[PDB]
Amino acid sequence: RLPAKAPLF
Amino acid sequence: GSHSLKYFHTSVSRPGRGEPRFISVGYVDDTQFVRFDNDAASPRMVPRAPWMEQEGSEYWDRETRSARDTAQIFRVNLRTLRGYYNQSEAGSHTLQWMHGCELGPDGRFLRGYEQFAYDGKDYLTLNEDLRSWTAVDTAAQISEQKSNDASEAEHQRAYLEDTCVEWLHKYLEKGKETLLHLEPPKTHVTHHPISDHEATLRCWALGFYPAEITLTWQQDQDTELVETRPAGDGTFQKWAAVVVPSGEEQRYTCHVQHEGLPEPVTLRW
Amino acid sequence: MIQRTPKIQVYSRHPAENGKSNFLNCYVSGFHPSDIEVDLLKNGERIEKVEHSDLSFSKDWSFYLLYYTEFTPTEKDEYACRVNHVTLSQPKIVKWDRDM
């Protein structure tokens, strides 16, 4: 499945 | 053989139009099975493979929430990186994300990866140990330090080593009738004389799955290869050509290596 | 900013045979940024209902897309692909060669 979120840069 | 679960995300900023376009595609080996595209009234994750259409509404609701969260984060990130590099808002910019995990022949975890790019160049790269991030540009190190403080490598490593593997196995089970089926290539050699002195021999490989293949010309000169291309039905195509003196055509053989072949194949015109 | 010019391939899903049903393909790859224009041509006129795959990209971050439609090859009809990109000074035409 997709990761829940992506990191904020 | 080996298997993999890979996702590719693309976000492209629209300078004066508000929200950026966000597209996400998911792959199992060389087969696409899902898609999320925010160019819609109420964007959702949809199936792109027939073995995914029995999946329940709870699966699609959560992937949609994860995709929407990711797209919001990417939109903020485009705004921040434009500040980092002192870029004007006159232009449109791109932020891409690729990550995946791959199994070995034994079915267990072999490797994972994760990488970020801004306008087509490496912005942030997860190191092969899945334990630290690396940034090339000086500005990118601002994001690297944010992620080192937040222990982002530890969250990403947990996804790749446990979650990605557990769901890759589930997809291989749901679609094994067509995902575990090897399609060997159909191969034949053609001949078209350029002139009285020379002729072209072209070695064809058609309708094979997966995409990985090798075509080699060998003499009992330079070879022209083409990029492996999609046929449109899930198989791939490729050919390799060489210019040979007329009368000596039988001297050259073509060697074809593919995972669907019981043994490599040798061809003569 | 990195800009990459597109590779173009025009080809049929099956080996070409006059009078037999087939699929015309235009494969664009290795281009950057993602925004692109692609049209399939029949005797110079644009084919109406061409579909395309979902955007995705290669290991080197460059994008690829497949445009396709049903067609019927004949000895006299010529098919082509029309691609325009920021890297191009003018749209490029690639003719379909059934032997490639």
Side-chain angles (χ1 to χ4, degrees), chain B residues 35 48 122 227 230-231 239, chain C residues 7 9 11 25 54 61 100:
Chain B
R35 165 189 65 199
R48 296 284 287 176
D122 281 6
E227 272 194 359
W239 58 256
Chain C
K7 301 165 182 186
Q9 286 197 66
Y11 62 99
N25 287 322
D54 305 327
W61 307 109
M100 292 196 306

Side-chain angles (χ1 to χ4, degrees), chain C:
Chain C
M1 192 173 76
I2 313 174
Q3 298 177 346
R4 292 182 169 101
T5 182
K7 301 165 182 186
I8 309 177
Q9 286 197 66
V10 185
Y11 62 99
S12 53
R13 176 185 306 184
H14 301 291
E17 199 160 343
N18 291 339
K20 283 174 35 67
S21 298
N22 208 320
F23 281 86
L24 175 61
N25 287 322
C26 186
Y27 185 57
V28 287
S29 62
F31 61 100
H32 213 290
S34 65
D35 292 352
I36 200 170
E37 291 158 283
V38 180
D39 289 294
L40 298 184
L41 297 183
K42 175 181 178 187
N43 303 309
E45 187 70 19
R46 168 182 176 259
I47 298 171
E48 294 178 340
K49 291 295 197 287
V50 177
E51 309 161 350
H52 70 95
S53 62
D54 305 327
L55 183 77
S56 186
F57 55 86
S58 301
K59 181 192 275 184
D60 63 344
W61 307 109
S62 65
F63 305 96
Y64 60 82
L65 289 166
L66 178 69
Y67 288 68
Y68 59 95
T69 201
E70 304 82 357
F71 83 132
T72 291
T74 77
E75 192 177 300
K76 274 297 172 66
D77 291 318
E78 290 181 277
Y79 294 81
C81 185
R82 179 204 184 100
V83 174
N84 200 17
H85 196 254
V86 60
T87 56
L88 301 175
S89 63
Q90 55 200 239
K92 201 184 173 193
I93 297 188
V94 174
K95 308 173 185 169
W96 174 53
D97 183 340
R98 74 176 70 197
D99 284 300
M100 292 196 306

Side-chain angles (χ1 to χ4, degrees), chain B residues 60-79:
Chain B
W60 299 114
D61 287 347
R62 192 179 304 107
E63 295 305 279
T64 294
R65 188 60 263 167
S66 297
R68 283 182 191 174
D69 279 359
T70 300
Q72 297 175 348
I73 298 283
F74 272 55
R75 173 182 190 176
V76 175
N77 283 341
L78 284 166
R79 282 178 74 193

Side-chain angles (χ1 to χ4, degrees), chain B residues 57-192:
Chain B
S57 72
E58 185 175 347
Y59 171 83
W60 299 114
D61 287 347
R62 192 179 304 107
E63 295 305 279
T64 294
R65 188 60 263 167
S66 297
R68 283 182 191 174
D69 279 359
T70 300
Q72 297 175 348
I73 298 283
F74 272 55
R75 173 182 190 176
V76 175
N77 283 341
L78 284 166
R79 282 178 74 193
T80 310
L81 278 59
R82 186 184 66 85
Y84 285 168
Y85 292 100
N86 292 276
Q87 302 178 317
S88 70
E89 210 179 358
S92 173
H93 298 271
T94 308
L95 191 57
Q96 289 163 271
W97 186 18
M98 72 181 204
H99 59 76
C101 66
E102 66 174 347
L103 306 177
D106 61 339
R108 305 177 194 279
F109 175 84
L110 183 60
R111 189 187 89 93
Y113 63 87
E114 193 161 326
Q115 284 173 245
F116 286 97
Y118 184 59
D119 287 333
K121 60 187 185 72
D122 281 6
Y123 182 74
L124 201 59
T125 301
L126 180 59
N127 293 320
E128 303 191 324
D129 58 355
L130 308 184
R131 187 95 185 114
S132 58
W133 295 91
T134 299
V136 180
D137 304 339
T138 307
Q141 290 163 48
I142 304 180
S143 304
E144 184 202 324
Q145 292 158 338
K146 278 185 182 177
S147 298
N148 290 345
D149 292 355
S151 299
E152 212 67 74
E154 186 176 328
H155 295 288
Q156 302 298 346
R157 172 175 152 267
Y159 166 75
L160 299 164
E161 282 177 7
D162 299 324
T163 305
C164 182
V165 178
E166 181 218 338
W167 277 92
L168 177 58
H169 286 144
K170 287 172 170 179
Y171 304 149
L172 288 170
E173 181 67 20
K174 294 176 182 302
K176 59 168 177 173
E177 61 285 357
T178 56
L179 290 166
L180 302 185
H181 174 74
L182 300 170
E183 267 301 326
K186 285 274 194 170
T187 53
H188 70 283
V189 176
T190 55
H191 172 277
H192 302 290

